[PDB]
Structures are given as structure tokens and as C-alpha cells.
Design brief:
InterPro entries: DNA-dir_DNA_pol_X, DNA_pol-X_BS, DNA_pol_b-like_N, DNA_pol_B_palm_palm, DNA_pol_lambd_fingers_domain, DNA_pol_lamdba_lyase_dom_sf, DNA_Pol_thumb_sf, DNA_pol_X. The modification N6-acetyllysine is found at residue 63. Monomer. Binds single-stranded DNA (ssDNA). Interacts with APEX1, LIG1, LIG3, FEN1, PCNA and XRCC1. Interacts with HUWE1/ARF-BP1, STUB1/CHIP and USP47. Interacts with FAM168A. DGTP binds at residues 140, 171, 174, 180-181, 183. The protein is 48% helix and 12% strand. It has 326 residues and is α+β, with helices and mostly antiparallel strands. It folds into four domains: 1-82, DNA polymerase beta, N-terminal domain-like (DNA polymerase, domain 1, Orthogonal Bundle), CATH 1.10.150.110; 83-139, 5' to 3' exonuclease, C-terminal subdomain (DNA polymerase, domain 1), CATH 1.10.150.20; 140-262, Beta Polymerase, domain 2, CATH 3.30.460; 263-325, 2-Layer Sandwich (Beta Polymerase, domain 3). A five-stranded mixed β-sheet has the order 2-4-7-6-5, sandwiched between helices. The chain has a two-stranded antiparallel ribbon with strand order 1-3. It is globular. The two termini are 13 Å apart. 31% of the residues are buried. The chain binds 8-OXO-2'-deoxyguanosine-5'-triphosphate, calcium ion (CA) (2 copies) and sodium ion (NA) (2 copies). One calcium ion (CA) is lined by residues 170, 181, 183, 247. The structure holds three DNA strands.
DNA sequence: CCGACAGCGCATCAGC
DNA sequence: GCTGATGCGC
DNA sequence: GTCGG
């Protein structure tokens, strides 16, 4: 991490713009700059050097100059000393509490972990579970545990219907040695873009994983997306494993490649790739890549038989999952 | 100078 | 109950 | 906050 100090600074600024200022585009701008700097293979010596990189503008170059000179940024030093900003920033670390709910809570005088813990009845379901596992959700998951979790999920799915295919995506698929949480793409031949020949396809899998005490809590659930909590089983006299976040996404089977492209990420990589897509006259989502007509309206879905086919349309050389960690 | 910035699932709520 | 906006999440 | 046109 040649430029750890700079990228940390930019990420902190991004988080401020998202959580406090509620300026989503400034947030994305800061994260884009951080990402491009993170991959730059030289230790940055100046703002001018950084300003050569796409996403790094005049304002950021100036901040980089301040940071390199003094080891800090006055702007951030202040934000840190602001009570309302500090509190809002903290509260948003709970899953289910966003910028709006955080500011609302601060208004009501709820601004610490202790405050939340004695005001559970003021939280919705998602927030209450977010609070419950606040500490656990802070922890990362060693790849070794991710592998054990993979085994459990794939084996339990197979026991429901051997025609299910479950794929672990996210940072795990990108080869990371540790992951923030588990993401599972699910397909079944009964669910395609042309028909749903069977109901409760996602439900049956969730139920099974709850049955073996793998899924422990539910944050939200619909016909195609599950968001919840899971936990590896522990051995005799062993301390329990931390509870982990799990997301499961049921995708039409004939749209697997667009699905897996999306679910593999990273998030910044996806934003960059979809952005480039627009520049190139296409629109990409987790289902399809379509041409944009002169009207601006998306045309019909183009044939896709691989992740590479999607890269081909937008004239990008294929990049393996491990090189999508932006 | 300024329009545009990726795209979408589920939960919650106001209005009807 | 439905629909569209909003919040929050991926 | 940055960028393309
Ligand atoms: N968190 C997040 N994920 C997004 C966004 N947009 C988008 O396409 N995704 C996709 C790509 C991500 O790799 C995928 C899974 O989300 P994730 O938060 O679990 O991220 P991850 O596996 O890459 O990283 P991590 O768990 O190790 O922290 O969702 C977004 O705005 N936020
Ligand atoms: Ca993940
Ligand atoms: Ca996730
Ligand atoms: Na630049
Ligand atoms: Na949050």
C-alpha cells in the first residue's frame, strides 16, 4: 500500500460526504479517486502527480499537497472534532441505519452504542439485528472460514434440489484472503427470463439453511433477494464463530453471466464498467446488456454466453475476477 | 461552462 | 390495498 | 468533485 495515507484520507472524506453531507456524487467522486490512487504503482510525491490520474481533480490534488506536507488534512481534523458529524458517522456503522435515520436519532438524543441498546423499541427490524451483531459485523472473514461456509451452503442447497447451482461471488470470487461478508448467487432451471415454473425457489433454500442453524437472522427477504445473518458451527468447548452477513440472490438461469459479473464486483469496478458501457452506447445490469438507441431508450438484450462476451461489447479486454478489485 | 454521474431489490410511508 | 417516493442495502 | 463536449 504505497499510498495508504492518501487513500485513507479520501475514503474518510467520501464517508463524510455520504453520511453527513448526504452528497452521493461527492462520495462517488472521492471513492473513484481513492480507487485509482490505490492501484497507481508509485509512491505519490505531489498533488500534480496525482492530478494526472482520471478522477483526481484540482481540489483533491490540493488536499494531497496538504497531506504530503503535514501528514494531515485540516478539513478532516475539523470534521473529527464536530460532535454531530462524529455521531452521525458512528450511527451509520450499524446495518440499517443510513444518513437520514442517523441524523434523526442524533436529534432525539440517541447517539451512542449505549443509547441504541436501551432504545431497541425505536429501531426497525433490520436496525435491531444490525445493533445485535454490531461488533461481529465489524470483523472480516478469513478465506478459510469462507471455504467452510461455501461447503455448507453448496451441500445444503444440493440437498434441497440437485438442480440448484450456488456460486459464491463478491471478494471471495476475486480471490481475496479475507471477505467482509458472503454473497451467494443462486440459479435453478425452473426460473428463467421466460418463465417461473416453480414458486418459493429462494424460500426453500433459506428455510433449509435455517433448519441446519446456518442462517440465524433475516434482515430482508423477497422472491429474488435474501439479506441476513449466518454462523459456522463450532466444536466442543470451542468459542463460537462470529455471526456473519450473508446475501443470496436468485437470478434467472439464462442470465447467469450478467448476474455473476454484477455479484463479483467490486462495487467501484461495476460503476466504472457500467459507466464505460454508457459511454460506448450500452447499458449493463445484473440481467442483461442492451444497446442504447438514438432515442436514449434501451434496446433488446444482446446474446451473452460468457462474462467475456460482456467485456467484448464494450471493447474492454477481459479481466479475471482477481483483477476487478478496484 | 454545465449536464451527468450505474443500476436495482426490499422495507417503509404518504396519499388516495 | 395499491402506487410512487424515499431510505438503505447489494 | 471530476469530467466531456
Ligand atoms: N456494497 C456494494 N456492492 C455493490 C454496489 N454496486 C454493485 O454492483 N455492487 C456489487 C459488487 C459487489 O462486489 C457485490 C457484493 O457486495 P459486497 O458489499 O459484499 O462487496 P465485496 O464482496 O466485493 O467486498 P467485501 O464483502 O469483502 O467487503 O455487489 C454498491 O454500491 N455497493
Ligand atoms: Ca461480500
Ligand atoms: Ca454482501
Ligand atoms: Na485527473
Ligand atoms: Na449503516
Amino acid at each position: 500500500t504505497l499510498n495508504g495515507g492518501i487513500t485513507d484520507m479520501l475514503t474518510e472524506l467520501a464517508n463524510f460526504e455520504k453520511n453527513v453531507s448526504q452528497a452521493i456524487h461527492k462520495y462517488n467522486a472521492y471513492r473513484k479517486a481513492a480507487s485509482v490512487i490505490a492501484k497507481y504503482p508509485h509512491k505519490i510525491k505531489s498533488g500534480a502527480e496525482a492530478k494526472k490520474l482520471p478522477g483526481v481533480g484540482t481540489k483533491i490534488a490540493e488536499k494531497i499537497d496538504e497531506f504530503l506536507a503535514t501528514g494531515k488534512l485540516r478539513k478532516l481534523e475539523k470534521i473529527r472534532q464536530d460532535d454531530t458529524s462524529s455521531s452521525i458517522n458512528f450511527l451509520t456503522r450499524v446495518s440499517g441505519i443510513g444518513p437520514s435515520a442517523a441524523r434523526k436519532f442524533v436529534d432525539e438524543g440517541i447517539k451512542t452504542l449505549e443509547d441504541l441498546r436501551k432504545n431497541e423499541d425505536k429501531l426497525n427490524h433490520h436496525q435491531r439485528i444490525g445493533l445485535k451483531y454490531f461488533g461481529d459485523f465489524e470483523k472480516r472473514i478469513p478465506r478459510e472460514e469462507m471455504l467452510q461456509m461455501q461447503d455448507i451452503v453448496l451441500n445444503e442447497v444440493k440437498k434441497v434440489d440437485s438442480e440448484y447451482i450456488a456460486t459464491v461471488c463478491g471478494s471471495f470470487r476475486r480471490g481475496a484472503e479475507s471477505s467482509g461478508d458472503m454473497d451467494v448467487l443462486l440459479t435453478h432451471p425452473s426460473f428463467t427470463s421466460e418463465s417461473t415454473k416453480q414458486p418459493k425457489l429462494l424460500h426453500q433454500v433459506v428455510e433449509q439453511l435455517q433448519k441446519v442453524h446456518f442462517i440465524t437472522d433475516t434482515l430482508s427477504k423477497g422472491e429474488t433477494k435474501f439479506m441476513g445473518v449466518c454462523q459456522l458451527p463450532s466444536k466442543n468447548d470451542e468459542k463460537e464463530y462470529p455471526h456473519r452477513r450473508i446475501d443470496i440472490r436468485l437470478i434467472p438461469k439464462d442470465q447467469y453471466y450478467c448476474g455473476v459479473l454484477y455479484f463479483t464486483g467490486s462495487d467501484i469496478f461495476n460503476k466504472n464498467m457500467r459507466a464505460h458501457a454508457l459511454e460506448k452506447g450500452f447499458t449493463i445490469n445484473e440481467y442483461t446488456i442492451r444497446p442504447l438507441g438514438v432515442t436514449g431508450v434501451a434496446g433488446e438484450p444482446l446474446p451473452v454466453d460468457s462474462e467475456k462476451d460482456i467485456f467484448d461489447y464494450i471493447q474492454w479486454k477481459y479481466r479475471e475476477p482477481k483483477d476487478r478489485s478496484e
